[PDB]
């Protein structure tokens, strides 16, 4: 009842220490292992030097083995700031004698921050990405810059292309290299979208496109500080990449996530089928991430997501384009081992009150919800006319997430202030109220689809099969856990729930 | 305890009924009268039809006389939606005999919304903007659309010997389009360009307006063009929002200088900004906005009026960037009030060289309307690290009940300014979950070697505006105290002593 010592079970967290950004994401196809590195301060639960890349491995992006610090700066003064991994199949670096399986030639491209210089180094691994050896005595790219970070490198066919943030000038620099050693400047993408205070963590990616062409390039650009809710946010651009220059199709601003706690998204260098685009993000915000009431670890990661470009618009009378997000979890094992509750053709009304009590609550559930607004004569514009689901919890049912929809605001809401944890009341950037403008799925029926995941301190809401997504953290009291889901509305028969599956995860 | 009956004193509110976006703003240079029109329902405090244009007049953009319903749709079901006003000096409309002063030849260009149709009509006034007459018993720009609204018109002086034209900016809303039509005579219109899918599209483009704005260049021209586009639904905070683009107008096309997204106001309750057709200086650009959010506006706890307007602001383009290592360009906003009259009819307070340690201000004969200025700086402290809330807060408490208060300040770990507007007894503020309690803005320093933050606030009963870095950043929000409970005391607090230093703090209550 001062800290919130409930730890996620399907979002990766460090065993201990401060975790702050996904790094070196790659997939080892011989061992069938997913590798997730992260910025890590092992000494404490706030950002500090020396900063390493923590390292964790998963068979299924659901269960993580955290091996702790792996890649390091080389002195207490410095940081192994963010960066990426690549698989040098053809041995362009020349680091790899025949004895290293081509599928495991992991080379890491990363920012050294020391004093006033941020410059990019490379370090190859000769043990499948568990330890690393620094290439030479020096960096491979130094521009006498203090803000020069977050290299994300891919193979373009062919050369290596690097995207780096010259953060303070709002620039993604693009650099090419034959061998990962000699880098030459190629184009300077600058002053696009929502600029905030800095550009951080760029990553350029080719993404499938389910039309109604085959693919499209996408540039991710993270922003901190200066995001529209406060602090950090992640935006993206849709366009094409000519080998040197990135050209956005349009002049639109697009956020990946409409919640306050989603930042520093990075994509896996590779996936098993070599087409799908997966990526993960740090699940917090820089305004309050180091004061989060968790111990002995601090930051959490989001779920992995699959990104595909879809034709979509926010109303039925126009045409636009949007990055759909589908969640990647091991749902076979999670749903087999877990207990499901459900509702159908339920017209919400005070007389027929309905609720779901969860047997042996675990704090980790998913749900699909399908609802419609029937309207009522008694609803008009000067009343709050909401369909609320209170996710109440087992030991203190005064701590709850309140989530739902209201006509007169035409939107979905998340209330995350109802908790005894002091932090949520004391830190004034942890907003109680969050909103998302969720489209219907079918404009002749006006059916709303929400799919959500709850894991102890974090909730992710995917609207309209993943066209809109909102990720936020909550903090219940310790060992308080969601055990009752309660359905309410002050207007009888005003709403109707077609479908409402819950599935508690037993973990 | 349920309804917050405190009416704003320097912001415009109708006598009674529901008020919505600003419309037909112009300046009468003959009588020196500012004319404001508003989306209006007099029959209730919620939107409904028939919607009229309410009319207000003011000498100083500070005190307004409300004249009620002036422009109407002519039918019960229908609605007289947003539009703008032009002064047809050289009588290009063919409506004005010479007994009508040129400075007074007022033509309203507005949207008629009736059943499934939304089309642009024009009406005109022969008594300087109080009564109006519809022209032709038909629209002047129809495109059988259901989402075709909010025409904002200005005059484009032709160069070389080309005559010059009226330019209309309209919203083809659902397709995120500002269409630019020209006309010689405000009657026959022709499509010139289709500005589409820019910035923050949200759900709909609404209330567009093209303007040319002075430019204070201190970089490495004289003017630049600005395009205002309002978005609702789909603002990032939820509901409504106003963005702007910076660029050039070549006579048919607006062309932005980048693909940046710039919000005019970072608060939750600043929407549908319209600029005045004309100003006294013929070069300054003034704008007014509707001070609420569509998500909760028709639920606000006020009677017998529902919406308020913001202060008029003076918009000027300056060189600005959010860090000291880059260049960019920003729309600076500068409040426009009758400060001479207000401050001299009113009571001042000061505080200097103050370093915060475990001071309060009692306002004498509280009026509830006040301005304040604040310069502060952060000093550091052994006891402040990344895992604490090290805030400098200012609690504007209430006289009758002081458990209702605004809490605004800065915090170092979040590097940003906050406003907490939840602390009140008014049920609406707890019941409506779209009425955010906590608002934030990433306010810059005003000098990067002194690290001094500058903040100018205006707090009229139930509405607060904040300007940062001399108006490079603005955040506007409504708040609701109990009936007859205006701001009485401001207490300055910080949990870390000597961490912050308030160099200046000039409060000035308005006795209006
Ligand atoms: C202005 O441009 C927009 C966007 O290109 C046009 O919008 C299209 O309108 C039709 C209906 O007539 C829709 O079915 C399309 O989906 C819209 N396109 C897009 C991209 O959203 C609009 O018609 C244009 N208006 C004029 C007057 O030219
Ligand atoms: C990439 O483009 C940006 C944008 O023009 C360049 O930014 C300038 O950098 C200097 C110092 O390096 C600053 O004083 C200027 O203010 C920056 N300009 C702007 C508009 O912010 C940047 O230098 C370019 N970098 C490379 C490597 O080409
Ligand atoms: Mg309207």
mmCIF file of N, CA and C and ligand atoms in Angstrom, chain A residues 166 169 171 173 185 188 190-191, chain B residues 325-327, ligand 2:
data_model
loop_
_atom_site.group_PDB
_atom_site.id
_atom_site.type_symbol
_atom_site.label_atom_id
_atom_site.label_comp_id
_atom_site.label_asym_id
_atom_site.label_seq_id
_atom_site.Cartn_x
_atom_site.Cartn_y
_atom_site.Cartn_z
ATOM 1 N N UNK A 166 20.373 12.511 -35.262
ATOM 2 C CA UNK A 166 20.940 13.762 -34.785
ATOM 3 C C UNK A 166 19.746 14.400 -34.095
ATOM 4 N N UNK A 169 18.698 18.361 -33.755
ATOM 5 C CA UNK A 169 18.330 19.028 -34.999
ATOM 6 C C UNK A 169 17.122 18.354 -35.655
ATOM 7 N N UNK A 171 16.706 15.337 -36.782
ATOM 8 C CA UNK A 171 17.142 14.713 -38.022
ATOM 9 C C UNK A 171 17.352 13.223 -37.828
ATOM 10 N N UNK A 173 19.567 11.046 -39.775
ATOM 11 C CA UNK A 173 20.612 10.867 -40.767
ATOM 12 C C UNK A 173 20.550 9.436 -41.303
ATOM 13 N N UNK A 185 27.762 9.616 -45.414
ATOM 14 C CA UNK A 185 26.467 10.279 -45.307
ATOM 15 C C UNK A 185 25.726 10.207 -46.634
ATOM 16 N N UNK A 188 19.443 13.417 -45.134
ATOM 17 C CA UNK A 188 19.251 14.066 -43.837
ATOM 18 C C UNK A 188 17.765 14.400 -43.708
ATOM 19 N N UNK A 190 14.487 15.537 -41.956
ATOM 20 C CA UNK A 190 14.555 16.560 -40.920
ATOM 21 C C UNK A 190 13.283 17.404 -40.836
ATOM 22 N N UNK A 191 12.842 17.654 -39.596
ATOM 23 C CA UNK A 191 11.724 18.560 -39.290
ATOM 24 C C UNK A 191 10.408 18.064 -39.886
ATOM 25 N N UNK B 325 19.728 24.241 -29.789
ATOM 26 C CA UNK B 325 20.692 23.774 -30.774
ATOM 27 C C UNK B 325 20.097 23.676 -32.166
ATOM 28 N N UNK B 326 18.930 24.270 -32.393
ATOM 29 C CA UNK B 326 18.263 24.103 -33.672
ATOM 30 C C UNK B 326 17.527 25.376 -34.052
ATOM 31 N N UNK B 327 17.089 25.415 -35.298
ATOM 32 C CA UNK B 327 16.188 26.440 -35.788
ATOM 33 C C UNK B 327 14.849 25.816 -36.147
HETATM 34 C C1 LIG C 2 20.942 17.830 -41.043
HETATM 35 O O1 LIG C 2 19.963 18.866 -41.218
HETATM 36 C C2 LIG C 2 19.787 19.696 -40.061
HETATM 37 C C3 LIG C 2 18.640 20.627 -40.359
HETATM 38 O O2 LIG C 2 19.034 21.649 -41.261
HETATM 39 C C4 LIG C 2 21.086 20.425 -39.739
HETATM 40 O O3 LIG C 2 20.841 21.166 -38.549
HETATM 41 C C5 LIG C 2 21.651 22.314 -38.281
HETATM 42 O O4 LIG C 2 22.833 22.097 -37.469
HETATM 43 C C6 LIG C 2 23.509 23.273 -36.977
HETATM 44 C C7 LIG C 2 24.713 22.796 -36.186
HETATM 45 O O5 LIG C 2 25.134 21.495 -36.589
HETATM 46 C C8 LIG C 2 22.538 24.111 -36.148
HETATM 47 O O6 LIG C 2 23.135 25.287 -35.609
HETATM 48 C C9 LIG C 2 21.357 24.489 -37.022
HETATM 49 O O7 LIG C 2 20.432 25.239 -36.251
HETATM 50 C C10 LIG C 2 20.662 23.229 -37.540
HETATM 51 N N1 LIG C 2 19.560 23.579 -38.426
HETATM 52 C C11 LIG C 2 18.275 23.445 -38.090
HETATM 53 C C12 LIG C 2 17.276 23.828 -39.142
HETATM 54 O O8 LIG C 2 17.930 23.040 -36.979
HETATM 55 C C13 LIG C 2 22.174 19.389 -39.492
HETATM 56 O O9 LIG C 2 23.426 20.002 -39.199
HETATM 57 C C14 LIG C 2 22.309 18.458 -40.693
HETATM 58 N N2 LIG C 2 23.318 17.444 -40.424
HETATM 59 C C15 LIG C 2 24.045 16.845 -41.374
HETATM 60 C C16 LIG C 2 25.051 15.835 -40.890
HETATM 61 O O10 LIG C 2 23.888 17.092 -42.573
#
